[PDB]
Amino acid sequence: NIEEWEEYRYVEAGIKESITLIEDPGLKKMVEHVCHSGGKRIRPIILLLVSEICSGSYSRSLNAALAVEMMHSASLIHDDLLDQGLVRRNLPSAPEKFGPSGALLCGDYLIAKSIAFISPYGEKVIQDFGKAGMDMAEGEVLDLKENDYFKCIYKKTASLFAISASIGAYTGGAEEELAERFSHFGNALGTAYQIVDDILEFLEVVEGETLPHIYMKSTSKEEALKKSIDCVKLHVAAAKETLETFRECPARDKLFQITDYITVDMLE
Amino acid sequence: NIEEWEEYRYVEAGIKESITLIEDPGLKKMVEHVCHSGGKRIRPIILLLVSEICSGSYSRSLNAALAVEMMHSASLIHDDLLDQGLVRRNLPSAPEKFGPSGALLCGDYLIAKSIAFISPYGEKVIQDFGKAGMDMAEGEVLDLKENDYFKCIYKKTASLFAISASIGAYTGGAEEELAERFSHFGNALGTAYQIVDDILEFLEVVEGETLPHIYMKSTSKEEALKKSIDCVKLHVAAAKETLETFRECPARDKLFQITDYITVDMLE
């Protein structure tokens, strides 16, 4: 029950306050929709938890957490625009919650807003934030166009988890060395997270690109699944190995909980 | 001949170096295309010139200038995507240099890249940069949906000119008070600039929304044009009035040249 955590409540509060700032009725309505997805605000919470691990506090990290969530939301909106109305042009138009123009502009608005929110954190944090945004765009380009698959997961998904953790560390007073270790934890979790998502997606196709599909180009179906799940366990193990090197406290305990919650628990 | 200015050459050098950093062949090719538009790099040059006025130097301002140009390019690409394939869905598909997916992702890539380039300039500059990005998205939303027309020009176009000048001032050691005066110059120039563009566009429609069209809802064609041009002269005058309060030097002379070059000179 992450919705019960103080960290979750703080992020939700920041999100709501953020929404009150939107003047354009249309944009406000769209943003309210993307935030009302029932998600668990994993990325921003990870950022606050890391700040807590490093400093025992997270008050000052709220805007960085919101910036990361805004970037995530912008990517979801743009990806929806891509998948629903920009790639299969000769086929029947797919349904879309927001109009195409609305989806594009709402995403641009959110990215710009994330810049305003990340603005007080300094050069290192802001440069990392920018680099993650670039990785995400490049990742999507690859996504629509073995090695490339994993380069894709890293760029499109792992990257944001990595900076949610490193920025959290930086906002909690961490030096480059420590922030780097958190980056590794984030990359590990994010990778396991995406593979899990791809496994579930692969199974949906079976019911009527993903890792299992990639492996089937040379091996059995189940074997492809077995190696995919082994890939998840490998990265989950890598994530926990790193987490174990950090200060023992409730925030660290929560990071362990999140790790299982979004990876192996989804494979039950 | 702005192409002969040291400021122009420095920006061009930065742009070229920036291009060498792009790993994805496709993205690199797209960026090369948007930069190879024959434009005069007005916004980034204004930023460098302002830094010169305030400090006598502009070396340290290159990345801020590039960030502003990247934001401009991203907006042009996204606007092309909007106008060409997201608004007139029931009509024949309009031709596009980049595929729809490519245009969207290239724009997102450039915005993120601008974040990485603006990263070392501090909270005030980065917050202003973010706010301009937001104004631009909101401006486009209004653009496609009297007071609204001018709110549109301010948000979509004047805003970027305003921060190109204010950020230039900040990078040149200016305090809030001085940077604000430059912001006013930029807003003035940007407004005159857009109205001029709208007047030329209006005349193209006459040959076979814009200010002249807006006025015609209650007055004659020529009268609508007369009041539109008077609007240009008003803002050009406002821009020069402000410029005259700044330190007399070659950079200031160049700002006067640019002011006429992109406004009244285009009306001959």
Helix ranges (DSSP H) in chain B: 6-20, 25-35, 42-55, 62-85, 100-118, 123-144, 147-153, 159-171, 176-207, 211-215, 221-243, 250-261
CA neighbours closer than 13 Å in the CB half-sphere of residue A111: 33
B206 reaches A (C-beta below 8 A): no
**Which residues have CB under 8 Å from B14's CB, separation 6+?**
B62, B63, B65, B66
Distance CA A45, CA A62 (A): 9
A157 assigned ligand-binding residue:
yes
B21 reaches A (C-beta below 8 A): no
Residue (of B81, B74, B80) closest to B109 by Cα position: B74
Residue A144 and residue B108: Cβ atoms within 8 Å? no
Long-range contacts at B244-253 (CB < 8 A, ≥ 24 apart): B245/B181, B246/B53, B246/B181, B246/B182, B247/B53, B247/B54, B249/B52, B249/B53, B249/B56, B251/B7, B251/B49, B251/B50, B251/B52, B251/B53, B252/B49, B252/B53
Are the C-beta atoms of A96 and B125 separated by less than 8 Å? no
SS3 B88: coil
Residue A111 and residue B108: Cβ atoms within 8 Å? yes
B2 reaches A (C-beta below 8 A): no
A99, A105, A145: residue with CB nearest B140? A105
Residue (of B100, B106, B97) closest to B73 by Cα position: B106
Residue A126 and residue B138: Cβ atoms within 8 Å? no
Q: Most B CBs within 10 Å: which of A73, A108, A126, A163, as the mutation test of the B interface?
A: A108
The experimental technique used to determine this model is X-ray
- Name the token pair of A94: 């797919």
CA distance B91 to chain A (A): 13
Domain boundaries, chain B: 1-268
A133 reaches B (C-beta below 8 A): yes
Q: What is the resolution of this structure in A?
A: 1.9
Are the C-beta atoms of B185 and B46 separated by less than 8 Å? no
Q: What residues of B are in contact with residue A23 (Cβ under 8 Å)?
A: 138
Are the C-beta atoms of A5 and A47 separated by less than 8 Å? no
Give CATH for domain A1-268.
1.10.600.10
Are the C-beta atoms of B65 and B48 separated by less than 8 Å? yes
* Backbone φ and ψ of A207, nearest 5°: -75, -25
CA distance A85 to chain B (A): 9
A98 reaches B (C-beta below 8 A): no
Q: What residues of A are in contact with residue B79 (Cβ under 8 Å)?
A: none
